[PDB]
Design a protein around this nucleic acid. Structure first.
Ligand code: MG
Lengths: 86, 479, 394, 447, 429, 140
RNA sequence: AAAAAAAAAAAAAAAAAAAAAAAAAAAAAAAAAAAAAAAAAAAAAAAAAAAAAAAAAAAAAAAAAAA
């Protein structure tokens, strides 16, 4: 789940694995949508930001912390990918 | 929600003895449970335990049969929820043991950072007329510098003696004050006699009992802002105490010591204020109580207590730049508001006197950070009055300020040593200048131990047993 | 003090614990059967174990059934209490060798049970009963084994001695067939000068392996090839002069000693060539080669080399076919350039050459089995989801 | 119903005593707080020994014998192998009483209840430590047929001393301490049979001498009808024969328990005075005691005086040992009681602490009384050290728990939570405050 | 699952009726210390502190003291009258003579010191505090109540004093005047009476301890036989006398009366042999305790009977007390880190935070509402859950706010893992 | 030849330097928490140095007595140090349930100073109690 | 006119090379060839080879005061 501020990930049980805010960088300040990363499908996300750091980021969900960041300036309404596209 | 709940009938909430705490509980496990207790020392049984600000509506909103009292101070009764260290009279049995025999105690260098080197230890007692006996000192010093004797009720200002002997402004001032009679200036004259005795003794041992008794008998002759300094002062008696070296005592002692020095300076036969201007920070302190019913006052406060509010990178110069110019608020009641007066207060030192004191009062987190920050403190910094603040850079090339770049070199400080044996004592570090060779040296002074150490060892704060508290920057030319 | 926990070795995969239960159910106290399907792919370790509540019925099932055919293979049922200690001691199966090729663990067990209950008995009884004439027999312990040594070292048993004195390697029934006085792997010394005679092949060589037969090998061409066959005493001295007299001086000239007609009792020459091929077989590329599958049939090494001519120094263009007939998809160009191969990862991966797309991956027969492991994973996964679906579908 | 241990350092783990090798008297520990492991595991093994049953029937044996149900056998090392054994654990109607029941079947020439009745009352009137309660004797038609049942108490850890030293797994022997302890226990029970005017009975020599208690026990169960199930001075002469037999036996078995080697018993025609004069690690005074315990030649029923006419000091040292064991037993029992009191105390503590609606501000106080309650909680539980790291010291906590558990009038200073609103408070007030809060929340009639 | 419902006199003679209540009252006597003593000696004197007194004339020289070096309740005696101890040689000699003195009823010499803290000089010694120190004359006659004494207790106390005799005479020394009833101290509902004073204060004043070979300690042995005899005789005649109240009948060496020692009220011939062995202090006897114990000859077994019977009763009641230490360490781990003020309001402890439901179940047990919404304990359910969470087994757990939020259905071993992880992270970095 | 005749460690704990230095060693041993682990089952296909550099990415072995029987027969055992208990946990979770040839490379803590024989004792006791119970039920 | 699907899920498969008797070859100098747990199962820390440990560092103080 993703709110305006909190990005939560529970397990299918309902038990909590992760939940973060914009932790020490302004990651989860402005939140738009979810993706997945080009290493696997039902795996770590590439979460859509617009100007929260004006760079879109992947976060390794299954280690607890960062995957990647990148500098795309413009605002994004919506995001999709099949396997390795953006 | 498993049905191992066919019966649990009686609410047996507490203290029933028709069923005791012998468990009728668990299903039969297989492995280790939660109570695996990790090893610990548990070394704090029996270490002699002991015993304006209005109450805010952090707690007043739920007060009934109330008795609060907003009176807790951090320097007064220490760290919140802290546990004191253990030092029983087996350490007094170590005081019964000898200090050193047939070697040099002057090893100021341990291989481990945790171990206290032998030079930072207690030196043994000075046995007087014992049976055909006396105590001797000639291995402890080989230089020509006079020593002290800790058999005096300060326990503290012996380092302040070795400190303020080494300020030529202060020294030449008071030895100028000595040549007149000045029968009213007690501490000024007697401090001057003490420093002149240490001067012309040339390595000969000294004591402070004249000035100890003079300071004491003055502070015995008691019942203003002097008295407001004195209202917490005299709680030193009956020396049994959890703090021998205490949090806030030598700081206030140096504070009102220099205050009384400038009072007796102001009541000489010549009435100079040369130390007052020379040492005083021009603190325009602006107690902005009301918009109208408030105060602005320029006080020429010679020292700088480091409250340490947020420590406002890691090193000392931005923290001093915070301490010069800083605003905050306060809930002290001013009468124009009647209720809890949400007053504010800003502080701005307007000068840069050639000698800068630094008295520390902060939490041990930042002390351990100084233990991590190598060369945390600054050896020689250059400062200048930019518009509302003394910017204190290393050189002027960082920022020249708006007013008259000076040249401020550290002379020394007072090191509290809280050793492995849980003994808290004081050691002077100083850097005596030589004009004959235009060089410097870092004299370590324990009570009568006199050596020279290196600068970076004197700058080394990484030891857990070593803590600076009272720091005297001078001007480099005035050094 | 375990009641019974017993070794059952030299198995075959037909013998399940159902069949072991059908064997040992009239023994009397069936506790459990630890079939040692080792956790790689349920394989046996060469053995299993049967646990019995009764110590006496376990001793019974041993002494009745030791090399008896359970489903057609003789049961090597012994003790293994000290056998993990023999594992993490290095000891265990000692080399009572030159055994009989027609006598199994049962007959020699009941024979030398007067020397002791053989706690680790094996002969070379593979191949559903055939012994090669040796094995690793070892008794209870050092005392009973040393009693068998000092009592029986060189006795007669169907016209054959035993040898536990030396750790005698394999092929021991055919040991004297190896030791036959006619055949022997000679030593070809290459590029010999004509000064070396039949006398000269025995002078400095009889110390490195005794020589009676010394033949200056002239060929069927009248001359010397320069290659002379040194006829030592044993193939180990063929070893000693292929790796000690290599380019040595007999008098003044070379001794490039190769093994003239190896008789296979010393071996593994150029098997490292195999591992040299492991530089380029399953780890195929070394970022150089290109397994390019799914060409056209008109794309021969012709059109493959034509496409890869901009892609570096072509060293091996090669398409395997149905006996140089029908290729079923795949070719290879070993390059000499890795960065042009990266340019092909860009370009010639996802590439039409003629009409059907190129397919690029590093070439291995290794992880076909790992892909089958993933097939097992997904098979058990769909089995699990179908089990949950049929469970909760009501 | 399943076989498992749950004691593989699992009930509470073992702790490294290498830190305890270099440790200060200020430095206490959790075992020094609570209990050493051995007594705990011994008592839990005793508890499971009492209840070695998981709910089943066991109807293949007869299961109810005259309001004694759950006949379950003492199979420790039961000397009735390849035979339906006779010594069971059974539960009475009254106390559910844990009993050893021993039933002797197939009797014909003992039909008089008067013989077993006089052996009953003659040995129910006896009373000693090692004189296990002789009870409940009658022939029955169950346990086969004509089973004369007798009843002793259950008394776990069947440790007939060959068990306690040679079947024993760590292999510890008995040195001179348990020597004199067993000496005064046997001297006690032979004084008891000289008092109650009966024989030595039947059993000795690692038979019926199962050590139930801790500090060294005889607990000789069978001194009963050897042959007369169906003079007395000669019997109280051959008591010395049995006794010096066991004493020569274990006095040479010390030399065999030097190693881990199971001994054999060394009956009367092995008692030789050269072996008396030549065995090792034996007191020569105790050798002269066995020289007297060269068996009773002059057939008077000799009392224990001529035995004890060599010594009385070591009997006092045995009494010393017994007093030492009782004293530090009472010490660790005081530790266990104060732990139980403080556990009920912290049950009362966190009973009302932590309401969901209270956790709003920094301090989690809702109403008037709750902040002066949870005033304490920081310097009681959340004790960061002097250096500044948040840790736990179990001995500052327990001295606090001592000082608060009474509720004395002595006050204490605290800073909570802003380090401005200081406080001092006395502890009876805290006690009454928690009580009034407990009635304010768990009023237990309406709230 | 793993368990069900589970677990005057003659020879036992040690039967307190509410016995754990008695022991916690004894420890309650060990507890408090009145801080406002007003003594000119402060708390912190010579490695000891919190000096609170006892009853007057050993109005002091009986000080309950919690220790600095040990941390243990001790008794102190002042000797507030002597002022001269010119030789530390003899002080060290006394340190040898009593630091090696080792027994049970001889309470162990800890240390001595001549302070200047009362105003005066005073050779204060310390021993071990025992709770509720009384004499037998206190236990019956001086203090309420008066238990009717049998001969059995007289045999017991006889065994105690012969133990003391064996102890100090193994130490080839003697006592002096301590065998008045007042200068001894019983140790509770059993006798087990532990003497304290041992009359060695004269040894600080002159030098007569086995060097005077007149030794003179054999004369002190016969003297203590006489003190022993008058002690037991006053005990006997006062027990017959104060069946209700007629206490005391204070008799001396002058009032020894071997006539009426033999013409006593209820003492048998074996007791009469005992007191006649005591009272006939003749020449050159140096009376054998082996002979007098041969006169005794039975009571050693009776006090072993009472000892092991009381012991087995102690573990029989100790059976249902043991489930505390694991439980108390559970609470240690539990409330060690629950509401730390840095972690009271932070990111990783909110409903969006990391260690969120470790709070939730915490007070779920502690504030489980009733059908009327009242949070009512029902400690059965509490300890059920406590042992289950202590275990680490895999269960399924409904949890509510009450309303429709933050519901998580969970098992235990992960809660175990996060608890130990948080505890270790707190413990150091 | 400067023939350096070595001395084995015979000097132990006379000055304060081993007393305070072993106090620091005990302070280290309060902070190791099972660093040097007993390597069990040195398998056939895993050598000493093969082990020592398979786990060189997973711990710093300050004391490496990983051998075979003078590299003759197998030891089957050695000692390999780790970093921290949670690094021990990840070393558990990564190298688990892998048969190399027949025995798993089980590098873990050291125990069984009796407790194998305590287990075998209580198992024999359980077998005795269950064996009389099953003999009783079978004899019905 | 032996003329085969031109590869899912980064599948999956080439090797990048030899005893040389080509001619008149004897019997292990190998350096070692050396498999067994799995009923809740195998378990050194200190720091790890004394192939040369002299090992009481004199002492003495007739004693204070200071009317
Ligand atoms: Mg004089």
């Amino acid at each position: 789940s993703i709110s305006e501020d909190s990005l939560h990930f529970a397990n299918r049980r309902g038990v909590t694995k992760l939940n973060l805010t914009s932790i020490d960088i302004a990651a989860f300040s402005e939140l738009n949508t979810m993706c997945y990363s080009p290493h696997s499908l039902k795996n770590n996300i590439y979460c859509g930001g617009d100007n929260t750091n004006w760079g879109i980021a992947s976060i390794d969900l299954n280690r607890g912390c960062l995957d990647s960041l990148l500098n795309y300036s413009s605002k994004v309404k919506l995001m999709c990918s099949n396997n390795k596209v953006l | 929600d498993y049905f191992n709940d066919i019966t649990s009938d009686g609410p047996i909430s507490v203290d029933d003895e028709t069923y005791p705490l012998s468990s009728v509980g668990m299903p039969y496990y297989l492995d280790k449970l939660l109570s695996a207790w990790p090893p610990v020392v548990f070394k704090s049984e029996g270490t002699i335990p002991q015993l304006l600000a209005v109450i805010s509506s952090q707690n007043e909103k739920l007060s009934t049969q109330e008795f609060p009292l907003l009176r807790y101070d951090r320097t007064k009764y220490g760290m919140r929820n802290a546990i004191p260290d253990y030092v029983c009279l087996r350490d007094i049995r170590k005081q019964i043991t000898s200090g050193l025999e047939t070697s040099d105690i002057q090893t100021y260098t341990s291989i481990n950072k945790y171990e206290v080197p032998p030079a930072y230890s207690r030196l043994p007692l000075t046995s007087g007329r014992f049976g055909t006996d006396n105590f001797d000192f000639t291995p402890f010093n080989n230089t020509e510098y006079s020593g002290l004797d800790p058999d005096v009720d300060n326990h503290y200002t012996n380092a302040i003696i070795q400190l303020y002997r080494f300020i030529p402004e202060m020294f030449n001032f008071v030895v100028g004050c000595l040549k007149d009679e000045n029968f009213e200036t007690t501490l000024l004259t007697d401090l001057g006699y003490l420093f002149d005795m240490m001067e012309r003794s040339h390595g000969k041992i000294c004591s402070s009992s004249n000035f100890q008794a003079s300071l004491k008998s003055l502070t015995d002759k008691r019942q203003e802002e002097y008295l407001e300094s004195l209202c917490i002062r005299e709680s030193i008696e009956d020396f049994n105490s959890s703090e021998s070296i205490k949090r806030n005592m030598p700081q206030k002692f140096n504070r009102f010591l220099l205050s009384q020095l400038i009072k007796e300076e102001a009541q000489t036969v010549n009435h100079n204020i040369t130390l007052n201007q020379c040492f005083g920070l021009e603190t325009e302190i602006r107690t902005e109580c009301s918009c109208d019913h408030y105060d602005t006052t320029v006080k020429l406060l010679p020292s700088l207590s480091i409250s340490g509010i947020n420590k406002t990178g890691q090193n000392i110069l931005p923290y001093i730049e915070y301490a010069m110019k800083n605003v905050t608020q306060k809930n002290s009641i001013c009468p124009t508001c009647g209720k809890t007066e949400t007053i504010t207060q800003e502080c701005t030192v307007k000068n840069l006197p050639s000698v800068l004191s630094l008295e520390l009062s902060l939490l041990d987190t930042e002390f351990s950070n100084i233990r991590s920050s190598k060369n945390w403190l600054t050896s020689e910094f250059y400062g200048s009055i930019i518009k509302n603040k003394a910017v204190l850079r290393s050189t002027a090339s960082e920022l020249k300020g708006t007013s008259h770049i000076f040249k401020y070199e550290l002379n020394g400080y007072v090191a509290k040593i809280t050793d492995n044996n849980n003994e808290t004592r004081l050691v002077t570090y100083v850097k005596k200048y030589n004009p004959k060779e235009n060089c410097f040296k870092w004299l370590m002074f324990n009570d009568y131990l006199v050596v020279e150490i290196t600068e970076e060892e004197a700058l080394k704060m990484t030891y857990p047993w070593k803590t600076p508290e009272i720091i005297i920057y001078c001007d480099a030319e005035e050094l | 003090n375990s009641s019974a926990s017993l070794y059952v070795g030299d198995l075959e995969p037909s013998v399940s614990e159902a069949h072991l239960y059908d064997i040992f159910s009239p023994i009397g106290s069936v506790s459990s059967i630890r079939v040692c399907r080792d956790a790689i792919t349920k394989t046996s370790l060469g053995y299993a174990y049967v646990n019995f509540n009764d110590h006496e019925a376990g001793r019974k099932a041993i002494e009745q059934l030791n090399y008896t055919p359970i489903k057609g293979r003789l049961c090597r049922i012994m003790w293994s209490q000290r056998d993990p200690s023999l594992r993490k001691k290095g000891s265990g199966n000692i080399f009572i060798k030159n055994l009989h090729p027609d006598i199994d663990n049962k007959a020699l067990y009941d024979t030398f049970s007067v020397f002791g209950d053989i706690l680790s008995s094996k002969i070379a009884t593979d191949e559903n009963g055939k012994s090669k004439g040796f094995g690793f027999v070892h008794f209870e312990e050092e005392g009973a084994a040393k009693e068998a040594i000092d009592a029986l070292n060189g006795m007669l048993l169907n016209g054959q001695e035993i040898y536990v004195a030396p750790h005698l390697s394999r092929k021991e029934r055919d040991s004297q067939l190896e030791e036959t006085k006619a055949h022997y792997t000679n030593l070809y010394v290459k590029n010999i000068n004509s000064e070396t005679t039949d006398e000269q092949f025995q002078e400095l060589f009889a110390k490195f392996g005794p020589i009676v037969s010394a033949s200056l090998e002239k060929d069927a061409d009248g001359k010397l090839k320069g290659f002379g066959f040194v006829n030592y005493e044993k193939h180990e001295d063929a070893v000693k002069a292929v790796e000690a007299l290599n380019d040595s001086e007999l008098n003044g000239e070379k001794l490039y000693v190769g093994r003239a007609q190896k008789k296979n009792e010393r071996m593994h020459v150029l098997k490292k060539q195999y591992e040299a091929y492991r530089l380029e077989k399953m780890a195929k590329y070394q970022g150089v080669n290109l397994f390019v599958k799914n060409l056209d049939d008109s794309v021969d090494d012709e059109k493959l080399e034509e496409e890869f001519a901009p892609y570096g120094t072509i060293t091996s263009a090669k398409v395997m076919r149905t006996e140089n007939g029908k290729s079923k998809g795949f070719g290879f160009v070993c390059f000499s350039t890795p960065e042009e191969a990266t340019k092909a990862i860009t370009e010639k991966n996802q590439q039409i050459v003629a009409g059907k797309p190129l397919y690029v991956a590093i070439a291995q027969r290794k992880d076909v089995r790992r892909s089958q492991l993933a097939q097992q994973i997904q098979a058990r996964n769909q089995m699990r989801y179908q089990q949950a679906t049929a469970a909760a579908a009501a | 119903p399943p076989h498992s241990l749950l004691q593989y350092h699992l009930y509470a783990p073992e702790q490294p005593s290498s830190l305890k090798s270099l440790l200060k008297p200020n430095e206490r520990s959790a075992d020094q707080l609570f209990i050493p492991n051995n007594i705990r595991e011994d008592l839990t093994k005793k508890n499971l020994s009492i209840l070695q049953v998981f709910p089943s029937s066991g109807k293949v044996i007869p299961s109810i014998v005259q309001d004694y149900f759950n006949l379950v056998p003492l199979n420790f090392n039961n000397n009735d192998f390849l035979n339906k054994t006779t010594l069971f654990k059974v539960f009475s109607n009254y106390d559910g009483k844990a009993y050893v029941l021993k039933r002797l079947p197939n009797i014909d020439k003992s039909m008089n209840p008067n013989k077993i009745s006089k052996i009953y009352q003659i040995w129910s009137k006896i009373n000693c430590t090692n004189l296990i309660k002789f009870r409940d004797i009658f022939q029955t038609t169950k346990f086969g047929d004509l089973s004369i049942c007798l009843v002793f108490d259950y008394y776990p850890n069947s440790l007939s001393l060959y068990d306690y030293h040679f079947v024993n797994f760590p292999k510890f022997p008995i040195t001179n301490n348990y020597l004199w302890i067993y000496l005064v226990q046997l001297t006690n029970v032979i004084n008891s049979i000289h008092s109650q005017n009966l024989s030595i009975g039947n059993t000795l020599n690692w038979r019926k001498v199962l050590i139930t208690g801790d500090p060294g026990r005889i607990k000789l169960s069978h001194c009963n009808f050897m042959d007369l199930l169906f003079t007395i001075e000669g019997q109280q002469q051959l008591d010395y024969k049995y006794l010096g037999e066991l004493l020569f036996n274990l006095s040479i078995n010390i030399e065999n328990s030097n190693n881990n080697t199971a001994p054999k018993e060394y009956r009367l025609e092995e008692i030789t005075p050269q072996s008396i004069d030549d065995m090792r690690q034996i007191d020569d005074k105790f050798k002269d005691v066995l020289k007297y315990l060269i068996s009773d030649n002059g057939d008077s029923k000799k009392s224990i005086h001529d035995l004890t006419s060599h010594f009385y000091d070591k009997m006092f040292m045995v009494l010393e040992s017994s007093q030492t064991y009782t004293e530090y037993m009472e010490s660790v029992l005081s530790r266990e009681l104060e732990n139980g009191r403080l556990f009920r105390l912290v049950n009362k503590l966190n009973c009302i602490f932590g309401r969901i609606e209270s956790r709003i501000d920094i301090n989690w106080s809702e109403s008037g009384t709750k902040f002066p309650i949870i005033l304490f909680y920081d310097y009681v539980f959340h004790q960061v050290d002097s250096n500044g790291k948040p840790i736990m010291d179990l001995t500052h906590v327990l001295r606090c728990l001592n000082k608060l558990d009474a509720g004395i009038q002595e006050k204490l200073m605290l800073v909570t939570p802003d380090e401005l609103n200081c406080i001092i408070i006395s502890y009876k007030e805290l006690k009454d405050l928690i009580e009034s809060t407990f009635r304010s929340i768990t009023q237990h009639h309406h709230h």
